[PDB]
Amino acid sequence: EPDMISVFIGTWNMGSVPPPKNVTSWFTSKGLGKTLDVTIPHDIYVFGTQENSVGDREWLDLLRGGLKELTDLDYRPIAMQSLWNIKVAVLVKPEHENRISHVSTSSVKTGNKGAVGVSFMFNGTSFGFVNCHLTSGNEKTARRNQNYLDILRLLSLLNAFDISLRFTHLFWFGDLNYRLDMDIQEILNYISRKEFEPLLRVDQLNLEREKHKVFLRFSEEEISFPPTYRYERGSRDTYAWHKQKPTGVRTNVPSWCDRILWKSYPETHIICNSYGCTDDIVTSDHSPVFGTFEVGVTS
Numbered sequence: 001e002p003d004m005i006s007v008f009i010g011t012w013n014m015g016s017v018p019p020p021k022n023v024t025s026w027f028t029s030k031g032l033g034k035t036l037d038v039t040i041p042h043d044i045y046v047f048g049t050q051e052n053s054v055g056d057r058e059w060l061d062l063l064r065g066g067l068k069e070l071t072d073l074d075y076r077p078i079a080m081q082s083l084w085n086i087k088v089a090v091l092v093k094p095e096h097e098n099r100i101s102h103v104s105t106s107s108v109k110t111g112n113k114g115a116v117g118v119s120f121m122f123n124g125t126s127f128g129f130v131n132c133h134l135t136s137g138n139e140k141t142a143r144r145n146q147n148y149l150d151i152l153r154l155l156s157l158l159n160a161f162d163i164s165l166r167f168t169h170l171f172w173f174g175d176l177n178y179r180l181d182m183d184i185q186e187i188l189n190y191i192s193r194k195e196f197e198p199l200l201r202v203d204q205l206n207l208e209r210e211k212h213k214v215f216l217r218f219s220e221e222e223i224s225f226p227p228t229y230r231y232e233r234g235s236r237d238t239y240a241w242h243k244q245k246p247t248g249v250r251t252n253v254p255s256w257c258d259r260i261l262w263k264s265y266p267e268t269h270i271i272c273n274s275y276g277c278t279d280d281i282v283t284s285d286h287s288p289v290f291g292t293f294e295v296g297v298t299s
C-alpha cells in the first residue's frame with residue numbers, strides 16, 4: 001500500500017583497507033553537502049564501494065549489523081554482486097520483503113575496473129542500481145566516457161532491446177573518477193574559501209554531461225561539499241595531491257571522483273533529500289558519499 005519509499009544510495013572508495021568500527025555518519029547523511037544534520041530508517045539501503053578488501057559475506061555482515069545497531073531492525077539483503085574489489089549490496093526493511101520481485105544481478109569488466117549492478121521490482125515500480133569504478137588519471141577522460149558506453153550496452157539487468165530505458169528509476173553511482181580541469185593552486189584557494197561553484201564549471205563529469213556525451217538526461221543534486229579525493233588518511237584537513245613514492249610520484253588534483261546520478265521517467269516523481277559526504281570517516285583517501293531520495297511506487 002505505500003505510495004512513497006525512501007532509498008539510501010551510499011558510495012565509498014574504501015582505499016584497499018577495511019572500514020572502521022563506526023560509519024553512522026554515512027548511513028544517516030551526516031557531514032557536508034546537502035546533509036541531514038529523530039533518525040528514521042530508510043525503506044531500502046543500497047551500498048556501492050570500489051576498493052573494498054573485505055570479503056563478500058564478511059562485508060554484508062557489517063552492513064546488516066550496522067543497520068541493526070542504528071534502526072533496531074533486521075534489514076534483509078535482497079541482492080549482492082562483486083567484481084574484484086567493486087561491490088554493491090541492496091538491503092530492505094523486513095516488512096518490504098514480500099514486495100521485491102524479478103531481482104537480478106550483473107557485472108561488466110571494462111584491469112580491475114568496471115561495474116556491478118542490481119535491479120528489481122518493488123510492487124509495480126522497477127529499479128536499477130549500477131555501482132562502478134572507472135579509469136583513473138587526470139588525462140583519461142576519453143577512456144571513462146568509453147567505460148560508460150561499454151557498461152551502458154554490456155550490463156545484463158527486455159535486455160536485448162534497450163539500455164538506460166529499462167527501469168522506472170536508474171541510480172548510477174560510484175568512483176566515476178572524473179577530475180577537475182584546473183591547476184592545483186586555484187583548486188585549493190577555492191576549496192579554502194569554500195567556493196565550489198567555479199570549480200564545478202570545470203569538473204570533467206559536468207563538462208561531458210554538458211556536451212551530451214555521457215549520462216544523457218541524468219540528474220544530479222547540486223554539489224555543495226568539498227572534493228572527495230584525494231585525502232590524507234587519518235584526517236580530512238589535507239589533500240594528498242602530490243606525494244613522492246618509490247612507486248612513482250603522483251600528481252592528483254582534488255576531485256569529485258565519487259558521485260550519485262539518476263534517471264527516472266516522467267510522471268514518476270522522485271525528490272532528493274540528501275546529497276553529501278562524511279568528514280569523520282578517515283580510513284580512506286576518499287570520503288564516503290551518501291544520497292537519499294523519496295521515490296514514488298505503484299501497484
Ligand SMILES: [Cl-]
Pocket residue numbers: 136
Ligand atoms: Cl589506480
